[PDB]
Amino acid sequence: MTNIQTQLDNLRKTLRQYEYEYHVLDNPSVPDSEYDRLFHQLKALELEHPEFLTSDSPTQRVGAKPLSGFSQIRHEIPMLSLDNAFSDAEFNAFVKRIEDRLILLPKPLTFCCEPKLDGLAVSILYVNGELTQAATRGDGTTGEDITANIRTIRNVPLQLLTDNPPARLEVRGEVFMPHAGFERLNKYALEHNEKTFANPRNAAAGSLRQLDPNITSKRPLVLNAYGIGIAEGVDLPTTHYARLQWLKSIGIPVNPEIRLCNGADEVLGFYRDIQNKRSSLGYDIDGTVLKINDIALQNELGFISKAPRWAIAYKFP
Ligand SMILES: CC(C)(C)c1nc(-c2nccs2)c2c(N)c(C#N)c(N)nc2n1
Ligand SMILES: Cc1ccc(Cn2cc(C(N)=O)ccc2=O)c(C)c1
């Protein structure tokens, strides 16, 4: 044991906890200055004793060297697409079809309702709690290795906040740029005669395609986790909301507007509430993602492969 290894371990634990409070809880227990005091105290100490420097330390988010290009990553579990609706009647028909298709329909039929963020879908792998890899969705089967870019995102933890992390956990979410960040970026890019972005989605896309993680770090990007891919060495909750709550309890950012709604009429109230709140969120959304909350019912309903919307095979008993 040394005093150095101990004060580095203590600084790291304290800083990760403050990052959680600030980013995930939105309830920091200390001022921004106090966090910074300890941050650059850890950074200096690590540089004075580089033998105790760790790859997942809060000070190691940004690569010093710009990359040559992005490698391609084939997802172990493919990243699926979403069905869409454009009206109340259309949404009700989607629900009436689920009601008929289920063996046993429960009363109530609970839905996990979330805002649909207007960002870029990503996959982040944590191996024994440590961030090792991150990929763009790409075409749902193959994507690009953006690990260095994802590591710069302030609300993305380099290590899970748990003493018993899964053997492997793949977190799936949307990377996006809030309005304030988007406005500052364009004001800076205008005042420095550089490329301005038409909308926050385009700014987030361009920032994640940046080969120099030093530029991505200057881009005000945010992750909101929506799902889980690989999950080994853990018994995941049996509902979708509880899985998002579990992700949040181990340090992962999830959207705070998520709610549970029983039946289509409650689900439609949520949709109208998010539509009215839309003008005050501080980030772009283009709809609401409505999911069957019970995991066993999701497994029963399963998925539909790439198929036309104009045909159906009505099978005989
Ligand atoms: C895993 C699956 C249930 C199919 C899914 N997919 C997406 C997508 N991301 C990219 C294309 S579809 C979601 C997505 N973009 C959001 C958002 N925002 C969300 N809340 N949930 C999503 N759920
Ligand atoms: C100088 C400075 C340092 C930190 C921050 C924001 N912030 C604060 C905390 C905190 N616990 O309060 C944790 C992480 C973080 O990113 C800003 C905006 C400016």
**Residue 291's domain is classified under what CATH number?**
3.30.1490.70
Beta bridge partners of 290: 113
Q: How many domains does the chain have?
A: 3
| 57 labelled binding-site residue | no
Residues 114 and 258 in one domain: yes
Residues 85 and 142 in one domain: no
**Spacing, Cα 28 to ligand 2 middle (Å):** 9
Residues 217 and 282 in one domain: no
Give the list of residues 6+ apart from residue 94 with CB closer than 8 angstroms, or none. 83, 85
What is d(CA 144, CA 136) in angstroms, rounded to the nearest whole number? 5
What is d(CA 197, CA 184) in angstroms, rounded to the nearest whole number? 11
**Spacing, Cα 94 to ligand 2 middle (Å):** 44
What is d(CA 114, CA 242) in angstroms, rounded to the nearest whole number? 14
Residue 116 catalytic?
A: yes
Say if CB 45 and CB 7 are below 8 A apart.
yes
What is d(CA 294, CA 292) in angstroms, rounded to the nearest whole number? 6
What is d(CA 199, CA 153) in angstroms, rounded to the nearest whole number? 19
Residues 183 and 247 in one domain: yes
Say if CB 156 and CB 223 are below 8 A apart.
yes
Q: Residue 154: which region, alpha, beta or left (left: phi > 0; alpha: psi -120 to 50)?
A: alpha
Asked if the peptide bond before residue 108 counts as cis, ω within 30 degrees of 0, the response is yes
Residue 259 lies in a domain: yes
Token pair, residue 189, equals 């890019």
Residue 73 lies in a domain: no
Residue 72 lies in a domain: no
Say if CB 158 and CB 131 are below 8 A apart.
yes
Which residue minimizes the CA distance to atom 17 of ligand 1? 116
Residues 109 and 127 in one domain: no
Residue 75 lies in a domain: no
Determination technique for this entry: X-ray
Name the residue range of residue 22's domain.
Answer: 1-61
Burial (CB count <10 Å: 0-12, 13-18, 19+), residue 173:
buried
Residues 238 and 150 in one domain: yes
Which is nearest to 110 in space by CA: 294, 296, 300, 302?
294
User: Resolution, in Å, please?
Assistant: 2.3
Q: Which of 14, 31, 61 is the last residue of a domain?
A: 61
DSSP conformation letters of the chain? --HHHHHHHHHHHHHHHHHHIIIIIS--SS-HHHHHHHHHHHHHHHHHSGGG--TTSTT--S-SS--S-PPEEE-SS---------SHHHHHHHHHHHHHHSSS--SS-EEEEEEEESSEEEEEEEETTEEEEEEE-TTSSEEEB-HHHHTT-TTS-SB-S-SS--SEEEEEEEEE--HHHHHHHHHHHHHTT----SSHHHHHHHHHT-S-HHHHHHS--EEEEEEEEEEESS---SBHHHHHHHHHHTT----TT-EEEESHHHHHHHHHHHHHHGGGSSS-EEEEEEEESBHHHHHHH----S--SS-------
| 129, 235, 240, 279 from 166: Cα distances, Å | 7, 9, 18, 39
Residue 316 lies in a domain: yes
Which residue minimizes the CA distance to atom 10 of ligand 2? 32
Residues 130 and 193 in one domain: yes
Residues 258 and 301 in one domain: yes
Single-letter amino acid code for the residue at 114: E
Q: What is the largest CA-CA distance in the chain?
A: 74
Residue 71 lies in a domain: no
Contacts of 211-215 spanning 24+ positions with Cβ under 8 A: 211/66, 211/67, 211/68, 211/69, 211/70, 212/66, 212/67, 213/62, 213/63, 213/66, 213/67, 213/148, 213/149, 213/151, 213/152, 214/62, 214/63, 214/64, 214/66
**Spacing, Cα 299 to ligand 2 middle (Å):** 41
What is the DSSP pairing of strand 120-127 with strand 168-176?
Answer: antiparallel
What is d(CA 168, CA 84) in angstroms, rounded to the nearest whole number? 31
Residues 195 and 125 in one domain: yes
Residues 4 and 30 in one domain: yes
Q: Which of 210, 231, 253 is the last residue of a domain?
A: 253
Residue 68 lies in a domain: no
Is there an atom of ligand 1 within 6 Å of 190 CB?
Answer: no
Residues 111 and 258 in one domain: yes
